[PDB]
């Protein structure tokens, strides 16, 4: 965006928001969290027993499922549990950190309906260097100045700690929490194991097995290329199961993309081919195709998890420095104003920092406004209704031709 370039350029301004960017993205990136969120949706819908699996990949009741397939269930459950944890414990924090940026920015610069805190600080400095002002009024202005800065320092520290807490939550998402949460790293390990096993046993049984499973892998590769290529999301984030269980959820908006429409047609073709195929081909390609895509997904969850850790360590440092600079403002700078009887330079710095804060506050608001909202295993992952809309409204599950 134009605004992202403005934010870097501004990132040098004292009392301002600093470099709240991440490459060509806002430091809280709409596109990043939208993409991640797609993988999580897929996770939230994973099946954990035979009947669920059949319903999910859309396999005829008349088809037998070999026993080694059962390994799927435990790891799918863990993956699902992970997704649910993320949905409850991680993603809402991201929304909150965006809100913290909007809140601070509108507080110091003022809400567009307005005086923000920086204008109030400026006027206080006016009173401190006014010669008409008697000594009592000076002393009072100084106390008010320090108090108001103290509130900004407290909030900045709160936001700093919130960013630290996001980093901690990410480390738990990836490495587990030493309790009932298995980490993405271990989930990835087991998913790769099961993938190897099932591929050896049921993924190379015939030429058509290899052909079709390779076709699905190619579609996932292209889909992923397209996803990583599209930088700018213009719509409120929603998700779609249009591509079905072979590929997983995608951000709804990306359905417009020509390449993705091509992929939808190739998927419709696969469905036609499988639904009337020899039973073992039908079964193996649905189940293992989906599993291969889940492995690609979990790889993406891992790497983008590590990336996000780096981003929120950066944000953490930004709030630390914001608080440090306001502490300097209320002590050393304020004393200099008193000694020099000159406040104009500080006042103009506060004006300029106000404008920079407006820029990042608008980006934070935009993020929030457009973000997505919404061995037994039968008790750890009970059946829920999560996929039912998708089973009732996605083409993959249309069986009129059966």
Author numbering: 12 to 125, 128 to 387, 445 to 472
From the article:
The structure of the trypsin-resistant core exhibits a group of long alpha helices (around 90 Å) that are amphipathic in nature, with their hydrophobic sides interacting and their hydrophilic faces showing greater exposure to solvent. This helix bundle is around 20–25 Å in diameter with a head domain folded across the helices at one end, formed from residues close to the C-terminus of the protein. Analysis of the trypsin-resistant core by SDS-PAGE following reduction and Edman degradation of the major band showed the N-terminal sequence HSLIH, corresponding to residues 12–16 of the Cry6Aa sequence and indicating processing after Arg11. The 3266.38 peak had the sequence CPENNFMIYWYNNSDWYNNSDWYNN, which matched the CTP2 sequence from residues 451–475. These results show trypsin cleavage after Arg390 and processing sites after Arg443 and, at a lower frequency, after Lys450.
One such Cry protein is Cry6Aa, a protein with activity against Coleoptera such as the Western Corn Rootworm Diabrotica virgifera virgifera and a range of nematodes, including both free-living (Caenorhabditis elegans and Panagrellus redivivus) and plant pathogenic (Heterodera glycines and Meloidogyne incognita) species that cause large-scale losses to agriculture. To increase our understanding of their mode of action and to facilitate further development of these proteins we have determined the structure of Cry6Aa in protoxin and trypsin-activated forms and demonstrated a pore-forming mechanism of action.
